[PDB]
Amino acid sequence: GKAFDDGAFTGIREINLSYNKETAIGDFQVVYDLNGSPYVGQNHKSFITGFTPVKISLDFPSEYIMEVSGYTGNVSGYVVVRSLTFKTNKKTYGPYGVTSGTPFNLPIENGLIVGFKGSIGYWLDYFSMYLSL
Amino acid sequence: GKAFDDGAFTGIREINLSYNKETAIGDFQVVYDLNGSPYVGQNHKSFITGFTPVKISLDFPSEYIMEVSGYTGNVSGYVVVRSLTFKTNKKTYGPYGVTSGTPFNLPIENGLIVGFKGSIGYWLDYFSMYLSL
Amino acid sequence: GKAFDDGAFTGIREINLSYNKETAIGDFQVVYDLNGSPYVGQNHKSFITGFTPVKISLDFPSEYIMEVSGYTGNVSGYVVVRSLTFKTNKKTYGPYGVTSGTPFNLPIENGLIVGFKGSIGYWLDYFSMYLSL
Amino acid sequence: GKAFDDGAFTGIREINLSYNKETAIGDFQVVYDLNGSPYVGQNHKSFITGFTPVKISLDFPSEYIMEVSGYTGNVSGYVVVRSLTFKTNKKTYGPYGVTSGTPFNLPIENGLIVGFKGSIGYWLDYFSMYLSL
Amino acid sequence: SGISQTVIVGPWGAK
Amino acid sequence: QSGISQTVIVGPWGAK
Amino acid sequence: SGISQTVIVGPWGAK
Amino acid sequence: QSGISQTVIVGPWGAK
């Protein structure tokens, strides 16, 4: 797939993603906060299309992500991120995608997700998160 | 379980734990680094005995943990940490305890684990990790 | 004067400032790094003209500021920043302005300047720096 | 002088210093906070004695240092820290010593002093501060 | 306040 | 916390 | 170097 | 990359 790396920002305003209920997560794009102004991140797109788009618009700055969870599994012989869920201090968003395979979860007691990196082919292959105070 | 919270330090020198394959992780104790000197954390003991002890003595500061993983699961009707694995830049320690239940993993691309907190009853109920640059 | 606050970034690529050899610092503008891309900071302009411009182009990322120093003092009845000097791991830029009044200095043993804020009227009235690892 | 380096802690509970109003700052010892508990730092002592001791007992955690300032000057052929003042969010402690020579100051808009290093011979030669969020 | 802060991830396990 | 990341800031130097 | 660094956790998924 | 946590350090002040 195509590796991406947004780097680190001061916060998250909006998450745009896409998914298919029979395969996996496809596209991913974040609207970051940068020093109190919105910064529209690169749109990281699947090599294919036909996904269902989702916009998660957070009530920034009071609302923030406290846990990212999901499932990784096999789609056409590739290990990919099949589903994501985003839990904030106020609401849960998801699950989006297919909830089967190996679960993973990153709960945060203190600190913030401030950036994402990863790789996307037909589907989101893998991802990592920048964390800060 | 009894809550514990070591707080944050400079790094990790040694992890002392105990486990039983039939059940879960029992005791947990960490020797931290504090500004280049060993800091002997409190031994957080299980309420019961019968565990196998494990001492993970790291080659500090050349060797440091790059991934913590394990499994949570039901033992005698309690959700607990059944298994832990510590992967460093040098080698892999574990799994200690059966790898059955709900997996979790915290790989670290950049940064260090500098502290642990959690709760231990008969078994390790839950834990969190302090991370720093 | 007029307050400004660039916020925090990944590093510093260029500083563009103006000064007068009989008065103080005037204009101040910074090209930051933001996750590997230049971020063109707003030009914070003096209310008055007559300054000499200087462009401090750093060999980012191998070259970075290790000490900022200067003088603060009276100009036309106002306490302003009269002089600045920027010392990097590779060379010294300045003094710019007038080396008179009360000296100040911020040497960095570990860490980076990642942002500036302050206020400029006829001259740079005051400034602060964001620091990060 | 003998170099010292306490490293970094959670915050500051007490500063013990000594000075002579004819010479300079003599001894320096900090009681840190380490994860909610007091940690008694090494006592950094001058090669000579005769100084007047002072104890700055902070109302930790509500009271914290916002600015450190002082003067460096020549005493009997040695360039040393002749004077220190600690300003907290509650009050000003000092100046202790002789307010003569070249001034320096470290004001903090956001963050905490969490550690000291430096060098002491007959007098405090120099010092640096660890800063953290 | 006067107490330093650190990123904390977790908890994993019960509750 | 809030959703806004924090940074150490030193200063100001200049006018009070 | 002159590049600020940040804690990064992951990756989760392939490889 | 080492197993030692790092922190911002400012200074020195005094004699340098």
Ligand SMILES: Cc1cc(=O)oc2cc(O[C@@H]3O[C@H](CO)[C@H](O)[C@H](O)[C@H]3O)ccc12
């Ligand atoms: C009935 C029973 C059976 C058994 O095998 O173990 C326990 C343990 C008990 O104490 C609990 O320890 C757990 C798990 O670590 C929790 O921390 C819980 O809060 C403790 O009370 C109680 C009954 C049994």
